[PDB]
C-alpha cells in the first residue's frame, strides 16, 4: 500500500506531543496538569538516558493506563473534559503499543520534486550536525530572548552560565548541554508547580504566573528546542548508519558558491567577529560597552597575524567573565542579547581558529569566464568603491 506506512510511522511522537500539550484546559487544578508534566519529564529522561529512549514500553503503557483511569474516574461543561483526556489516552495507548510492536523496532537500528526534497533534507541534517554547537547556541539565543527580552526566569543566570561555559569549550559543550536539558526540565517542573492556589500572598524572581498559559511557554519552547536537538542528533546517527575542493573552487560558479557556503566563516571569521563587536558597541551605548570596545581595539592593536590567536582564548575567557556578571547585575537587556550573540561568534572563532587540517592569478586579469569577470571586479573595482 501507500498511505498505511505513512500513517504507521509518524505515530508516537505526534501523539505524545498532542497528549502532553492538551493539559490545563481548565481552572487551577493539580489533578490533570501534573500527569502531563510527569509525562514530559519521563520523555525527557528517556531521551537523555540514551538507553531507554524506546525501551520502557511498560512505563509508556502504564502511563496511558493511568491517564485513561483518571479520565474515566474524573470526567456544556461536562462534554469536553471526557472527550479530551478519554480520547487522548486511548489514542496514546494505541499509538504506543502499535509503534512498540512494529514501528519502534523498524525505526530503531538496535512530478519528481521528492528527490530534491530529500536531498535538501539530508543536507540540512548534515549542516545541523556540523552546526550542532551553533544549534545549541541558537537555543541559548531563544533562551535569552525569553530571559532578557521577555522576562527573567527563575534563576535564569544558571542556564545562561551553563551556555556561557558551554560556548568556548568542546569538552564542556555536550556534558553541559545535557545538564542544561536537565536543568530546563527541572525549571519546567518548578514552573508548572508554581501556579497553585495556596500561595498565601531579590534573587528569586518568582513571577507568580497568573494566566496559567504564558508562564509555561518559556520552558515549553526550551524543552522543544532540546528535543529538536536530540532528534537531530538521533536522525544524524540513523542516516549515518543507513544508506567542491578547496583548490577546485575557481572552476565554476556553482563550485565557488559551494566553497563559500562550506567555509563562509573560515577565513572570514575574525572579520565577522570584529563586525559583530562593532555592531554591539554601536547598539549598547554604555560604559560597559566602552570597556568592551577598549578590549576590542586592544585585540585589533595586534595587527600581525597569529598574535591575536594567543589572546583569543583569553578573549573568550574575559568575554564570559564579563557577560555572566553583567547578566547577574541586570538580574539583582537586548544589548545583553546581542552581547551574548557576539560572545557566541567569538566562541565559534576560538573553536575553529586552529583548523590545521585544510597561482591562476593572471587568469584573473582578463575576463575568460563568469568567475573571473567578477573576480577582477572584486580585486580592483572594490578598492575604488571603498
Do residues 53 and 100 lie in contact, with contact meaning Cβ atoms separated by under 8 Å? no
Q: Is the dihedral of CA 256, 262, 264, 269 positive or negative?
A: negative
3-state per-residue secondary structure call for 224-249: HHHHHHHHHHHHHHHHHHCCCCCCCC
Taking alpha carbons only, the member of 346, 349, 378, 383 closest to residue 365 is 378
Query: In terms of Cα–Cα distance, which of 275, 13, 327, 320 is closest to 143?
Result: 327
Would residue 351 be called left, alpha or beta, if left means φ above 0 and alpha means ψ between -120 and 50 degrees? alpha
For residue 95, the SS3 value is helix
Other CB atoms within 10 Å distance of the CB of residue 380: 12
24 in Cβ contact with 212 (< 8 Å) = yes
Query: Can you tell me the distance from the alpha carbon of 174 to that of 1, in angstroms, rounded to the nearest whole number?
Result: 42
- Angle between the N-to-C axes of helices 217-241 and 113-130, in degrees from 0 to 180, rounded to the nearest 10: 110
Q: Of the candidates 233, 256, 208, which has an alpha carbon nearest to the alpha carbon of residue 370?
A: 256
240 neighbors 128 (Cβ within 8 angstroms): no
**Residues in the chain, overall count:** 386
Alpha-helical (H) ranges within the chain are 3-9, 12-20, 30-49, 57-74, 85-98, 104-107, 113-130, 132-147, 156-166, 173-192, 217-241, 253-262, 269-284, 287-301, 307-331, 334-352, 370-376, 382-385
Angle between helices 132-147 and 217-241 (to 10 degrees): 170
Tell which residue, 218, 237, 202, has the closest CA to residue 109. 237
For residue 200, how far is the Cα from the chain centroid?
Answer: 38
Please note each residue after which the chain is broken, C-to-N distance over 2.5 A, or write none.
75, 110, 201, 243, 332, 358
Distances (CA, A) of 72 to 67, 88, 144: 9, 12, 41
State the angle between helix axes of 132-147 and 334-352 in degrees (0 to 180), rounded to the nearest 10.
170
Q: Are 226 and 132 in contact (CB under 8 A)?
A: no
Cα separations in angstroms, 75 against 34, 94, 335:
16, 21, 50
User: For residue 51, how far is the Cα from the chain centroid?
Assistant: 22
- CA 12/CA 18 separation, integer angstroms: 10
Closest CA to 138 of 218, 214, 222: 222
For this PDB entry, the determination method is cryo-EM
Return the residue matching grid coordinates 508554581: 194
Cell match 570584529: residue? Answer: 274
Burial of 209 (0-12, 13-18, 19+ CB in 10 A): middle
Cell digits of residue 132 = 550542532
- The full DSSP string for 21-48 is TT---SSS-HHHHHHHHHHHHHHHHHHH
Those residues whose C-beta lies under 8 Å from the C-beta of residue 167, and which sit 6 or more positions away, are 133, 137, 140, 173, 316, 320, 343, 344, 347, 348
Q: Please state, in angstroms and rounded to a whole number, the distance separating the CA atoms of residues 153 and 145.
A: 11
CB neighbour class for 160 (10 Å; exposed up to 12, middle 13-18, buried from 19): buried
Burial (0-12, 13-18, 19+ Cβ within 10 Å), 86: middle
Q: Given the C-alpha cell 532528534, which residue does it identify?
A: 231
CA dihedral sign, ordered 114, 116, 121, 126: positive
343 contacts 323 by C-beta, under 8 angstroms:
yes
Distance CA 49, CA 304 (A): 48
The DSSP secondary-structure symbol of 209 reads -
- How far is 298 from 60, CA to CA, in rounded Å? 58
CB 313 within 8 A of CB 168: yes
Resolution of the experimentally solved model in angstroms: 4.5
CA distances from 229 to 44, 81, 181, 376, 378 (A): 12, 33, 10, 43, 39
**CA–CA separation, 72 vs 67, rounded Å?**
9
The residue with cell 481552572 is 27
Amino acid at each position: 500500500e501507500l498511505v498505511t506506512g505513512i500513517y504507521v510511522k509518524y505515530w508516537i511522537y505526534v501523539c505524545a506531543g498532542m497528549f502532553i500539550v492538551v493539559s490545563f484546559a481548565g481552572r487551577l487544578v493539580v489533578y490533570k496538569i501534573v500527569y502531563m508534566f510527569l509525562f514530559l519529564l519521563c520523555l525527557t529522561l528517556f531521551q537523555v538516558y540514551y538507553t531507554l529512549w524506546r525501551k520502557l514500553l511498560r512505563v509508556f503503557w502504564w502511563l496511558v493506563v493511568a491517564y485513561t483511569m483518571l479520565v474515566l474516574i474524573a470526567v456544556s461543561e461536562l462534554f469536553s473534559s471526557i472527550l479530551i483526556p478519554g480520547f487522548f489516552l486511548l489514542a496514546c495507548i494505541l499509538q504506543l503499543h502499535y509503534f512498540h510492536r512494529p514501528f519502534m523496532q523498524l525505526t530503531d537500528l538496535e512530478l519528481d520534486l521528492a528527490a530534491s526534497f530529500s536531498a535538501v533534507l539530508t543536507r540540512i541534517q548534515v549542516f545541523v550536525r556540523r552546526l550542532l554547537e551553533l544549534h545549541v547556541f541558537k537555543l541559548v539565543a531563544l533562551y535569552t530572548v525569553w530571559v532578557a527580552l521577555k522576562e527573567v526566569s527563575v534563576m535564569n543566570l544558571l542556564l545562561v552560565v551553563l551556555w556561557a561555559f558551554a560556548l568556548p569549550y568542546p569538552r564542556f559543550r555536550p556534558m553541559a548541554s545535557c545538564l542544561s536539558t536537565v536543568w530546563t526540565c527541572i525549571i519546567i517542573v518548578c514552573k508548572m508547580l508554581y501556579q497553585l492556589k495556596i500561595v498565601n500572598p531579590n534573587w528569586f524572581g518568582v513571577r507568580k504566573g497568573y494566566p496559567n498559559l504564558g508562564y509555561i511557554q518559556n520552558h515549553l519552547q526550551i524543552l522543544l528546542l532540546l528535543v529538536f536537538e536530540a532528534v537531530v542528533y538521533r536522525r544524524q546517527e540513523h542516516y549515518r548508519r543507513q544508506h567542491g575542493t578547496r583548490q577546485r573552487l575557481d572552476q565554476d560558479l556553482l563550485s565557488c558558491l559551494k566553497y563559500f557556503i562550506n567555509f563562509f566563516f573560515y577565513k572570514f571569521g575574525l572579520e565577522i567577529c570584529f563586525l559583530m563587536a562593532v555592531n554591539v558597541i554601536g547598539q549598547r551605548m554604555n560604559f560597559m560597552v566602552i570597556l568592551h570596545g577598549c578590549w576590542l581595539v586592544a585585540i585589533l592593536t595586534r595587527r600581525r597575524r597569529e598574535a591575536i590567536a594567543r589572546l583569543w582564548p583569553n578573549y573568550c575567557l574575559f568575554l564570559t567573565l564579563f557577560l555572566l556578571y553583567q547578566y547577574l547585575l541586570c538580574l539583582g537587556s537586548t544589548n545583553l542579547i546581542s552581547d551574548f550573540l557576539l560572545l557566541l561568534c567569538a566562541s565559534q572563532q576560538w573553536q575553529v581558529f586552529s583548523a590545521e587540517r585544510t597561482n591562476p592569478i593572471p587568469n584573473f586579469i582578463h575576463c575568460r569566464s563568469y568567475l573571473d569577470m567578477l573576480k577582477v571586479a572584486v580585486f580592483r573595482y572594490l578598492f575604488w568603491l571603498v
